[PDB]
């Protein structure tokens, strides 16, 4: 059966609902209140083949920050739930994607241990109305609740939209690879220590 | 059916014919008038599993330049023709190949948008009789007519033949990956915008 | 008869229509959804004497990016269509235009071979609401579909609007020159190789 | 039938036995007298899906060095034996694996030509009781007898155990890829020169 | 009547014949024994609209040098002869031409005073079989016998053939401009001192 | 009896035959298709007193590279075969040879463990028609199949032929020394570990 994770998360700042199918067909269904983020989440669906359902509202008159963070936190938890015990999966993903002059390498391990390595240098402060500092925060928050080791490396790029979008494409492909079935491992846990856990 | 692209292109400088099968079995059939380039195109076939048929004549007494360029232009157009609407493909390719001390990373996106990122530093001017400046020009011309985003990164290397040949091997494997069927996407166009085009 | 090129181009991101007359009288008729870009396209008409008809709509709530790019792509294709075989033209254009303290050199060759050389350093991120990174992208996309070799050199300038507008004025005058009839060449193709092509 | 290589190797310094199944199920069975190395060889099995059987004894009161080297030499020979003529294989492997803050890229070519490129900078001298200089020597010795071109690149890392273990995970995945069947090449030798050899 | 200059020049090193029509139709008829130089002289005809007739033989087994120089000297003298008293001409020419990534500015004054300013940095030693040092020498020798002030400035470029060919295109267009009739000056000498002379 | 090693090695690129007598009288009999390499192999015979018989043909129209490499590989294997168990030999060789201003130190150990240390800086790209990058590759390939530890150090030199030829003279004398009988060791294996092996 398809691996589906669902999360609802409300604070005084934001209200978020997420449903992710790891075994999806690339259904894009994201409405966060942050249009640029929606476009990025569409890459996650289109290139990762995840079914991505996201709804969020929040205090965007203060900053897109809280919405951005809370969407990411909920996506991470949805991934954690969908992944379960992580039996039989590839576990590791590794992909470098361009978008024109931009080139972004993403490597990840569905380890249970959160870590973000990130070196993007996005040369403008706003892409549309979206604060480009929020890209790093999206990935940091997602790693923290998913229990993912994630490295994002900027190999080339100048246009801020190209840099960010190449990142989401590379991430989508790496995460697709990591979450997919390993055809040789016979459903075993892919760890020498016998378990993968966020604790 | 196999995706085959064919091009014939004649100017006062050169005369070129190309036929490429994306769904080939690695048939190597290149005769450009530039022996080193023929050897490189053989890697494209051997490692990419393309069937590669190339014939060229031209003004090599002036320079290998025009022949090299026109072969590349025609190969790019043949790729464009064979790819068609680009439905159902992986779209992205990413591979790093060594040849002894040389190590070359190639990442590409069959986007419809031409771009070459290239940082090779080939330490000699002639490999056999082949002018090593012509390597960059081969890839630039190929991207321009294929509508490919292509990045070529030199990670290591000293011997010029090793550097160039590792590049063609990495390119061949990345292009193979990008052109192959995506087994999960059900024949859809791999783009959130609904189309991939060179225009 | 006047050389007119027309393009219609729709994706899930944008919808664009362009009509350009190379042999125009400077009719300015641009409405892209990006007011600053409209003002720049008016320079193309006023100084280049092109008739410039552009309509675009698109996802500007995400970013002006996709609209900007798609307008440029369509303009490039319209230029390509209008130019045809490029018989009898000057082919090359070269002009440096000031706007107050700004001074921008544009040189171009209607070669069939796309290339952008660009060194502008625009010191602010937004001119009005227009993201100044999008200037480079406009010219890159236009070159890619027109098959133009284009160099843009910033010789002086501080005010971002002056820098960008001087660029469009210099480009307009260089493109006017290149597209105009060469009064001495008797309708021949202006190339030693006997043809000019985007392939 | 499964590709299995077996080696027994005794000197006045060490006594080593190795059996490797390239077509394994990740059976981990390593006892070298060097506990840290055993843990690393377990990654080779767990992530590479090799069946790895190693026994060694030796002069560890002098140094772990001779044991470490002789284990590596014998593993390399076992790989060479199991690989045979190298018909029908992918030949090339390329993978970047993290372990928390560490990130290690491994690229290899089962060429028949030994070469190690290695740039790890392991910041401590002993991980447990294991001398960290011995990591480079393990890979160098393994390449020398297997006839492998191998590049190991440290992209990030601080903790010595993380750096070394990420290396073994990346190596395991790259070697798995290279040794696996190429589903399209019809059992042919993956070389334009018609043979792959250690001589 | 058309302004035609003819020169025959023989030494123990070379034998050269040149005929140039300033008021030509771009007839290309150059055979120097140096194929790359022939291709460059074809640009002079194609883009300058000069009729260019050149024949040379010489000691190319020693070096292309003497032939290259003697062709240039004879072309310069042919230009001087064709120009005569220089009445009614534009006198000055100024053009910047690209060839792909190369961009070369040429400015010249048909002053009667020889001078070459030249800053090309051609990154390879041989383009085909042609020694790239000989480019500077071609222009220096041509200026010396024509009595031309000539500046050649490399603004961009990497490929040696592109750099050199862009130079010849820019030179051709600048020389065309300078040699053409000034439509407003009523056949007067374009000099405040009342004469233009090589002495 | 004399220690003689013989190798025949054919690929789609090259065809090579080698016979080496370690206990020779300096018979020079090398014809590789690379005249400069033949002259170098003559030093190996003249100064090393090896009998050196080499025949090669190959794809020199592509590059001398494959021939050069394959000759070296076969020489290394011939040395390995002739050396056998390496009983009773000096094992180590060490010699510094000049050729005029050039001075090259070679130290080697017939260890069974391949390694090349090399720091030559050959200031020209072609000596005759021979690509000077191929010198390093000759020694690397020879070490790889012979199981030799080899260090080559440039102490002085400017003329490329002098540098390369001094290298071959020093190598010849060092290899002669290493392969010769140790008059005191009574036919024992010259190793504390009781064996010398390439595995
Ligand atoms: O959890 P796994 O499968 O990655 C195996 C562990 O030994 C990794 N590890 C973490 N810190 C030191 N080693
Ligand atoms: O064409 P695709 O599938 O890569 C999706 C586009 O949004 C990419 N893009 C290009 N410039 C800015 N975004
Ligand atoms: O196409 P044209 O008219 O500019 C003439 C070509 O020879 C130019 N060229 C491009 N690369 C090397 N030469
Ligand atoms: O052996 P392969 O399949 O990698 C093909 C050879 O041409 C490679 N090569 C090694 N040195 C120069 N070229
Ligand atoms: O010969 P012309 O027409 O350029 C006018 C001269 O005054 C130029 N000049 C040369 N040196 C100083 N002035
Ligand atoms: O093989 P031999 O005769 O040189 C003796 C070995 O102990 C050498 N060695 C290699 N690595 C560490 N020690
Ligand atoms: Mn926060
Ligand atoms: Mn986008
Ligand atoms: Mn070119
Ligand atoms: Mn090769
Ligand atoms: Mn874009
Ligand atoms: Mn204005
Ligand atoms: Mn050792
Ligand atoms: Mn561990
Ligand atoms: Mn001279
Ligand atoms: Mn040319
Ligand atoms: Mn080689
Ligand atoms: Mn000599």
For the four alpha carbons of F132, F133, F134 and F137, in that order, the dihedral sign comes to: positive
Which residues lie closer than 8 Å to B183 by C-beta, 6 or more apart? none
Q: Based on the domain organization, do D194 and D168 belong to the same domain?
A: yes
Reduced to 3 states (helix: H, G, I; strand: E, B; else coil), residue E130 is strand
CA nearest F73: which of F81, F84, F85? F81
Q: Based on the domain organization, do F129 and F173 belong to the same domain?
A: yes
Angle (CA) E151-E153-E154 rounded to 5° is 155
Q: Residues with beta carbon inside 6 Å of ligand 2?
A: A 99, 161, 165; B 111, 191-193; C 65-66, 69
**Integer Cα distance of E118 and E154 in angstroms:** 8
Q: Which of D24, D27, D46 to mutate to test the interface with A (most CBs of A within 10 A)?
A: D46
**Integer Cα distance of E52 and E81 in angstroms:** 14
CA E148 to chain CA centroid, Å, is 10
Distances (CA, A) of F65 to B128, D115, F161: 8, 18, 18
Helices E160-179, E35-48: axis angle to 10 degrees equals: 40
Bridge partners, residue C127, by sequence: C130
- B125 and E124 in contact by Cβ < 8 A? yes
Q: Which residue of B has its CA nearest to D106?
A: B96
Burial annotation C99-110 (CB, 10 A radius, 16+ → b, else e): beebbbbbbbbb
Q: Based on the domain organization, do F131 and F178 belong to the same domain?
A: yes
B72 within 8 A of B142, measured Cβ to Cβ: yes
Q: Based on the domain organization, do B111 and B199 belong to the same domain?
A: yes
- Quote the number of domains for chain F: 2
- CB contacts of B156 in chain D (<8 Å) are 117, 151
**Integer Cα distance of F172 and F178 in angstroms:** 10
**Integer Cα distance of D193 and E112 in angstroms:** 63
CA nearest B194: which of B48, B40, B87? B87
A130-131/B4-10 β-pairing: unpaired
Which residues lie closer than 8 Å to E6 by C-beta, 6 or more apart? E17, E18, E19, E78, E81
Distances (CA, A) of F6 to F52, F54, F88, F113, F178: 10, 10, 21, 21, 20
- Looking at chain A, the number of H-run helices and the number of E-run strands are 4, 10
3-class secondary structure per residue, F134-149: HHHHHHHHHHHHHCCE
Question: Which of C90, C114, C129 lies at the terminal end of a domain, its last residue?
Answer: C90
Distances (CA, A) of B44 to B165, D93, F106: 10, 17, 40
Atom nearest to A192 CA in ligand 1: 3
DSSP alpha helix (H) spans, chain A: 35-48, 65-83, 134-146, 160-179
E18 within 8 A of E7, measured Cβ to Cβ: yes
Q: Which residue has the tokens 């060919």?
A: E165
Which residue in D107, D186, D190 is closest to B98 by CB distance?
D107
Angle (CA) D171-D188-F73 rounded to 5° is 70
Q: Based on the domain organization, do D106 and D45 belong to the same domain?
A: no
Q: Is B69 annotated to bind ligand?
A: yes
Q: Which residue has the tokens 């060194």?
A: C119
Query: Is residue D165 in contact with ligand 1, taking CB distance under 6 Å?
Result: yes
F130-131/F126-127 β-pairing: antiparallel
**Integer Cα distance of B143 and E9 in angstroms:** 48
How many angstroms does the Cα of residue D130 sit away from the middle of ligand 13? 15
Helices E134-146, E65-83: axis angle to 10 degrees equals: 30
- CB contacts of A160 in chain C (<8 Å) are 133
Q: How many CB atoms lie within 10 A of CB F33?
A: 17
How many angstroms does the Cα of residue D153 sit away from the middle of ligand 1? 20
Output the six-digit token pair for C108: 């171009």
Q: Based on the domain organization, do A101 and A79 belong to the same domain?
A: no
CA nearest A115: which of A145, A74, A150? A150
Q: How many CB atoms lie within 10 A of CB F51?
A: 19
**Integer Cα distance of D41 and D79 in angstroms:** 14
Which residues lie closer than 8 Å to A133 by C-beta, 6 or more apart? A125
- CB contacts of B159 in chain F (<8 Å) are 65, 133, 136-137
How many angstroms does the Cα of residue B173 sit away from the middle of ligand 17? 20
Output the six-digit token pair for C88: 């009898």
A160 within 8 A of A132, measured Cβ to Cβ: yes
**Integer Cα distance of F20 and F5 in angstroms:** 5
Q: Based on the domain organization, do D74 and D96 belong to the same domain?
A: no
CA nearest D98: which of C53, A149, B53? A149
Instruction: Provide the resolution (angstroms).
Output: 1.1
Question: Which of A61, A90, A119 lies at the terminal end of a domain, its last residue?
Answer: A90
CA nearest C54: which of D103, C68, C46? C68
**DSSP string of chain F, one letter each residue:** ---EEEEEEE-SSEEEEEEEETT----EEEE-S-HHHHHHHHHHHHHH--EEEEEEEE-TTT-SHHHHHHHHHHHHHHHHHHHTT-TTB--EEEEEEEETTEEEEEEEE--S--EEEE----S-SEETTEETTHHHHHHHHHHHHHT-EEEEEEEE--SHHHHHHHHHHHHHHHHHHHHSB-TTSTT--S-TTS-----
Query: Is residue E197 in contact with ligand 5, taking CB distance under 6 Å?
Result: no
Specify whether the backbone of D52 is left (phi greater than 0), alpha (psi in -120 to 50) or beta: beta
Q: Is B21 annotated to bind ligand?
A: no
Number of inter-chain CB pairs under 8 A, C vs E: 52
Q: Kindly report the backbone phi and psi dihedral angles of residue F197, in degrees, each rounded to the nearest multiple of 5, phi listed first.
A: -150, 150
B102 within 8 A of B158, measured Cβ to Cβ: yes
Question: Which of C90, C117, C138 lies at the terminal end of a domain, its last residue?
Answer: C90
| Distance (Å) from the alpha carbon of A10 to chain B's nearest alpha carbon | 30
Q: Based on the domain organization, do B56 and B106 belong to the same domain?
A: no
**Integer Cα distance of A31 and D33 in angstroms:** 57
Burial annotation C62-74 (CB, 10 A radius, 16+ → b, else e): bbbbbbbbbbbbb
Q: Based on the domain organization, do D81 and D113 belong to the same domain?
A: no
Query: Is residue E194 in contact with ligand 5, taking CB distance under 6 Å?
Result: no
Full residue range of the structural domain in which residue F76 is found? 1-90
**Integer Cα distance of B174 and D107 in angstroms:** 14
Q: How deeply is A173 buried, as exposed, middle or buried, from its count of CB atoms within 10 A (0-12, 13-18, 19+)? A: buried
Which residue in C13, C73, C195 is closest to B11 by CB distance?
C195
Q: Based on the domain organization, do D54 and D126 belong to the same domain?
A: no
**Integer Cα distance of E52 and E31 in angstroms:** 10
Q: Which DSSP state fits E89?
A: B
Q: How many CB atoms lie within 10 A of CB B123?
A: 12
CA E87 to chain CA centroid, Å, is 20
**DSSP string of D14-80, one letter each residue:** EEEEEEEETT----EEEE-S-HHHHHHHHHHHHHH--EEEEEEEE-TTT-SHHHHHHHHHHHHHHHH
How many angstroms does the Cα of residue A53 sit away from the middle of ligand 18? 76
Q: Based on the domain organization, do B3 and B80 belong to the same domain?
A: yes
**Integer Cα distance of F62 and B128 in angstroms:** 6
Q: Based on the domain organization, do A114 and A58 belong to the same domain?
A: no
E122 within 8 A of E136, measured Cβ to Cβ: no
A40 within 8 A of A72, measured Cβ to Cβ: no
Q: Is B92 annotated to bind ligand?
A: no
Q: Which residue of D has its CA nearest to B96?
A: D94
Physical contact, B and C (3 or more Cβ pairs within 8 A) = yes
Instruction: Indicate which CATH number applies to the domain containing B47.
Output: 3.30.230.40
**Most distant pair of Cα atoms in chain D: their distance:** 51
3-class secondary structure per residue, B43-84: HHHHHHCCEEEEEEEECCCCCCHHHHHHHHHHHHHHHHHHHC
Which residue in A42, A97, A101 is closest to B192 by CB distance?
A42
**Which residue's C-alpha comes closest to atom 11 of ligand 1?**
D162
**DSSP H or E segment with residue E129:** none
A87 within 8 A of A189, measured Cβ to Cβ: yes
CA nearest C168: which of C84, C77, C78, C72? C72
3-class secondary structure per residue, chain C: CCCEEEEEEECCCEEEEEEEECCCCCCEEEECCCHHHHHHHHHHHHHHCCEEEEEEEECCCCCCHHHHHHHHHHHHHHHHHHHCCCCCECCEEEEEEEECCEEEEEEEECCCCCEEEECCCCCCCEECCEECCHHHHHHHHHHHHHCCEEEEEEEECCCHHHHHHHHHHHHHHHHHHHHCECCCCCCCCCCCCCCCCCC
For the four alpha carbons of E140, E146, E147 and E153, in that order, the dihedral sign comes to: negative
Q: Which DSSP state fits A189?
A: -
Q: How many CB atoms lie within 10 A of CB B84?
A: 12
Q: Is F3 annotated to bind ligand?
A: no
Which residues lie closer than 8 Å to B125 by C-beta, 6 or more apart? B131, B132, B133, E124, E125, E126, F125
- CB contacts of D98 in chain A (<8 Å) are 107-109, 115, 117, 149-151
Which residues lie closer than 8 Å to E62 by C-beta, 6 or more apart? none
Q: Which DSSP state fits A128?
A: T
For the four alpha carbons of D157, D162, D168 and D169, in that order, the dihedral sign comes to: negative
Using beta carbons and an 8 Å cutoff, which residues of D are at the interface with F?
9, 11-13, 66, 73, 77, 113-114, 144-145, 192-195, 198-199
Span between the terminal Cα atoms of chain E, in Å: 26
Question: How many Cα atoms within 13 Å fall on the side-chain side of residue F11?
Answer: 20
Output the six-digit token pair for C121: 């350093």
* Whole-number CA gyration radius for chain E: 16
């Amino acid at each position: 059966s398809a691996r589906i994770g669902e999360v609802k998360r409300e604070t005084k700042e934001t209200n978020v609902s997420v449903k992710i199918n790891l075994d999806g067909h690339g259904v894009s269904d994201s409405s966060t209140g942050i249009p640029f983020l929606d476009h990025m989440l569409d890459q996650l669906a289109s290139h990762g083949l995840f079914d991505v359902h996201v709804r969020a509202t929040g205090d965007t008159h203060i900053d897109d920050h809280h919405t951005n963070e809370d969407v990411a936190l909920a996506i991470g938890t949805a991934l954690l739930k969908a992944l379960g015990e992580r039996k039989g999966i590839n576990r590791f993903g590794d992909f470098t994607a361009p978008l024109d002059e931009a080139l972004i390498h993403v490597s990840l391990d569905l380890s249970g241990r959160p870590y973000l390595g990130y070196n993007l240098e996005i040369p403008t402060q706003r892409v549309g109305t979206y604060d480009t500092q929020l890209v790093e925060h999206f990935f940091q928050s997602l790693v923290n609740t998913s229990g993912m080791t994630l490295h994002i490396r900027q190999l080339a790029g100048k246009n801020s939209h190209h840099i960010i979008e190449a990142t989401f494409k590379a991430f989508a492909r790496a995460l697709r690879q990591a979450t997919e079935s390993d055809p040789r491992r016979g459903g075993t846990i892919p760890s020498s220590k016998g378990v993968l856990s966020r604790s």
